[PDB]
Design a protein around this ligand. Structure first.
Ligand SMILES: [Cl-]
Ligand SMILES: [Cl-]
Ligand SMILES: [Cl-]
Ligand SMILES: [Cl-]
Ligand SMILES: [Cl-]
Ligand SMILES: [Cl-]
Ligand SMILES: [Cl-]
Ligand SMILES: [Cl-]
Ligand SMILES: [Cl-]
Ligand SMILES: [Cl-]
Ligand SMILES: [Cl-]
Ligand SMILES: [Cl-]
Ligand SMILES: [Cl-]
Ligand SMILES: [Cl-]
Ligand SMILES: [Cl-]
Ligand SMILES: [Cl-]
Ligand SMILES: [Cl-]
Ligand SMILES: [Cl-]
Ligand code: NA
Ligand code: NA
Ligand code: NA
Ligand code: NA
Ligand code: NA
Ligand code: NA
Ligand code: NA
Ligand code: NA
Lengths: 106, 106
């Protein structure tokens, strides 16, 4: 079974062009949600009714409707050292929505 | 621009095998979230920071990381007439998570 779950994704800020304002860290663990949303479903996939219905419609009309998507359903913050307006290193202690805490089918 | 938004999807319960317990309605408007999550983004796409970061990593490593996904971010209920344990038609007034209220990139 190849289902919806959290897997590693280490993100280098230089690589996405955010080194222009993030001094540190260089890299972080963002994680990614990977996996299929198909029947039979897993139990920590926490599907909405809509995701279930859509997956079923896709099974019957695959060319016309896509299947539900394995996505983050909860995110966590990281700390970033960034450059203030004046250019001063300023800590953002809780920089929200940066790392995957949980995945599910939506 | 071809971006993340709500589009129609009319779902017939016979077609997804739920006619075994749903007496009515026959069909409903579930809606679906369709569209790309790419730069430049729209304004009602309400992307998480994670979705932004991931889309950027995908742009630089397309074979290795997928892009963010246009998915429902808010759902609404519908009413369904279903069959009780004893077989009696019972109304479920607010049957949650059934129809798309809003879409965004996640
Ligand atoms: Cl399986
Ligand atoms: Cl299942
Ligand atoms: Cl739900
Ligand atoms: Cl849920
Ligand atoms: Cl298919
Ligand atoms: Cl979220
Ligand atoms: Cl803390
Ligand atoms: Cl903070
Ligand atoms: Cl923040
Ligand atoms: Cl455009
Ligand atoms: Cl943008
Ligand atoms: Cl966010
Ligand atoms: Cl948000
Ligand atoms: Cl690409
Ligand atoms: Cl939701
Ligand atoms: Cl009401
Ligand atoms: Cl109810
Ligand atoms: Cl419910
Ligand atoms: Na089809
Ligand atoms: Na998916
Ligand atoms: Na999310
Ligand atoms: Na949090
Ligand atoms: Na690549
Ligand atoms: Na998508
Ligand atoms: Na949702
Ligand atoms: Na609601």
């Amino acid at each position: 079974g190849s289902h919806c779950q959290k897997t590693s994704l280490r993100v280098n800020f230089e690589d996405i062009g955010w080194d222009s304002w993030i001094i540190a860290p260089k890299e972080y663990e963002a994680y990614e949600c990977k996996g299929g949303c198909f029947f039979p479903l897993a139990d920590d996939v926490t599907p909405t009714k809509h995701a279930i219905v859509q997956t079923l419609v896709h099974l019957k009309f695959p060319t016309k409707v896509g299947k539900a998507c394995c996505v983050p359903t909860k995110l966590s913050p990281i700390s970033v050292l960034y450059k203030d307006d004046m250019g001063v290193p300023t800590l953002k202690y809780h920089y929200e929505g940066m790392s995957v805490a949980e995945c599910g089918c939506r």
